[PDB]
């Protein structure tokens, strides 16, 4: 069933109140970057290499140790490692094959209203909204002083 493994990276604003989407090779599309990951490598270490190479920035102490989510959409395997704690002082830009490079910061509010779709929307995150939200909700709790 699973012959080709795929993994993506989901980054949230410093206030963990908004989602950062990017434009891929597709035209009117909006989602996190993904692709094949190296085998025989620690999922975490693999993240840094795919994160620092894709986003351009590396997360040393701003990356979760054992926090990730799994979800299969349309029979397609889609894995995403939760990584929050980044700052807004640094600018993150996409760095992939020569094509289109555009950044768009969409508020989770809009994503939560995906139902309000009228034309073309990214249902990809809609399916992962459950885990993404629930899990991300946990990180917000720790934000507390205790």
Swiss-Prot record:
Residues 2-129 form the Nudix hydrolase domain. Mn(2+) binds at residues 50, 54. The modification Phosphoserine is found at residue 17. Changing residue 89 to A: In strain: YJM339. Disruption phenotype: Increases autophagy activity through accumulation of autophagy-related proteins in nutrient-replete conditions. Disulfide bonds: none annotated. A motif (Nudix box) lies at residues 35-56. It comes from the Eukaryota. Changing residue 43 to V: In DCP2-7; impairs mRNA decay at 37 degrees Celsius. It is found in: Cytoplasm, P-body. Catalytic component of the decapping complex necessary for the degradation of mRNAs, both in normal mRNA turnover and in nonsense-mediated mRNA decay. Removes the 7-methyl guanine cap structure from mRNA molecules, yielding a 5'-phosphorylated mRNA fragment and 7m-GDP. Decapping is the major pathway of mRNA degradation in yeast and occurs through deadenylation, decapping and subsequent 5' to 3' exonucleolytic decay of the transcript body. Blocks autophagy in nutrient-rich conditions by repressing the expression of ATG-related genes through degradation of their transcripts. Present with 8530 molecules/cell in log phase SD medium. Belongs to the Nudix hydrolase family. DCP2 subfamily. Component of the decapping complex composed of DCP1 and DCP2. Interacts with mRNA, LSM2, LSM4 and LSM8. Interacts with EDC3. This is m7GpppN-mRNA hydrolase. It comes from Saccharomyces cerevisiae (strain ATCC 204508 / S288c). The lineage of its organism: Eukaryota, Fungi, Dikarya, Ascomycota, Saccharomycotina. The gene is DCP2. The chain holds residues 100 to 245 of 970 of the full protein.
